[PDB]
Amino acid sequence: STGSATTTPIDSLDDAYITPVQIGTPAQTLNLDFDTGSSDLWVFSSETTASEVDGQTIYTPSKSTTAKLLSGATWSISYGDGSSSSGDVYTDTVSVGGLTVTGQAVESAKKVSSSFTEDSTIDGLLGLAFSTLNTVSPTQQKTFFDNAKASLDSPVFTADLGYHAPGTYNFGFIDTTAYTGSITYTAVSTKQGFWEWTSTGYAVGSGTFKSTSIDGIADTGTTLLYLPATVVSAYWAQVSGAKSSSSVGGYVFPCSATLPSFTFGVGSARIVIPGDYIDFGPISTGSSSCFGGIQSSAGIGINIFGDVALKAAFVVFNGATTPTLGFASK
Numbered sequence: 663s664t665g666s667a668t669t670t671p672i673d674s675l676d677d678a679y680i681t682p683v684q685i686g687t688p689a690q691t692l693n694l695d696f697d698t699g700s701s702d703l704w705v706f707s708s709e710t711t712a713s714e715v716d717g718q719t720i721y722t723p724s725k726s727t728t729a730k731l732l733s734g735a736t737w738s739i740s741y742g743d744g745s746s747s748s749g750d751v752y753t754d755t756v757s758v759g760g761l762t763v764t765g766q767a768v769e770s771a772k773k774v775s776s777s778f779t780e781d782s783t784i785d786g787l788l789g790l791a792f793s794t795l796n797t798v799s800p801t802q803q804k805t806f807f808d809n810a811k812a813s814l815d816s817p818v819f820t821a822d823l824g825y826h827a828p829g830t831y832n833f834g835f836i837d838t839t840a841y842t843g844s845i846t847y848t849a850v851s852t853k854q855g856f857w858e859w860t861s862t863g864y865a866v867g868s869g870t871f872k873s874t875s876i877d878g879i880a881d882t883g884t885t886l887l888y889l890p891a892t893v894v895s896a897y898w899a900q901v902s903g904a905k906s907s908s909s910v911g912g913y914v915f916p917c918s919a920t921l922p923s924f925t926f927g928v929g930s931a932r933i934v935i936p937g938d939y940i941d942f943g944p945i946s947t948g949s950s951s952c953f954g955g956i957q958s959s960a961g962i963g964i965n966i967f968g969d970v971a972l973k974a975a976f977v978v979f980n981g982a983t984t985p986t987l988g989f990a991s992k
């Protein structure tokens with residue numbers, strides 16, 4: 663089997679991407695944030711505290727003939743940005759782009775934090791990291807990908823995120839028309855439950871490539887590119903007027919600037935992030951100070967190749983017995 667679904671930016675800045683997902687019988691379609699940095703599939707639901715729902719589409723398990731309460735199971739997750747959610751668990755039929763999994767754990771939110779409430783466009787998350795990170799207790803549950811894997815033509819999914827444009831998540835096959843040149847594959851460590859890999863270095867604009875190992879995770883659920891302070895300082899030094907602002911919470915730059923590209927290494931291959939991918943617009947409405955798309959990982963504990971990096975590439979998440987990651991230009 664295979665699946666193919668279009669993923670769409672939630673706003674004009676590509677702050678996140680949503681992908682339609684069919685849950686239950688008859689189908690209830692929710693727009694979920696596919697997140698390769700976490701491993702829970704959770705949704706706004708008929709069980710979510712009323713005051714914490716503001717415009718989201720909810721899952722109502724009582725209206726699904728295939729929904730079954732997973733007795734005694736609860737879940738609770740907190741993300742790197744401090745957001746969080748929790749609730750109980752159903753199993754139900756879940757389909758993504760024509761690919762169907764029966765008995766998928768669908769985690770129903772009873773509580774969500776304010777940032778989820780305030781985002782009317784995201785109805786929940788679909789985790790695509792390794793199932794070892796799944797928070798369901800007392801019996802850990804598998805991700806959609808892990809459940810589907812055996813049935814897929816090939817045990818892979820691919821992320822093809824657009825810049826200010828729709829893109830595609832494919833499951834079970836590699837669309838050879840969706841990228842240019844070749845796909846370069848690189849080793850993955852699953853020791854922390856992430857798609858963790860080591861970049862071979864970087865360049866700023868037309869500058870010389872710096873060969874240096876940068877360990878980090880491929881995370882579709884993170885907006886920006888978070889890299890070591892040395893690397894990030896070298897980037898923003900090439901932008902006149904750019905500075906790190908503690909009040910704003912990162913590097914900002916004059917909105918009149920032209921941003922240089924940023925290149926990262928994948929083995930001997932190179933992925934080039936165009937400068938305008940790194941522009942996340944005015945820090946507040948009407949401001950002439952703009953927020954940068956490359957930020958320091960110093961306060962995070964990990965480097966994160968988020969959407970800013972990934973949308974410059976066609977990315978293969980290879981879930982073979984020994985997982986690997988593939989990157990191609992496009």
Ligand SMILES: NC[C@H]1O[C@@H](CC(=O)NCc2ccccn2)[C@H](O)[C@@H]1O
Binds near residue numbers: 881883885
């Ligand atoms: N500290 C490492 C962990 O932090 C995550 C980064 C994060 O929170 N991104 C934003 C975000 C918000 C809401 C939902 C999903 N992502 C990584 O995926 C790891 O899991």
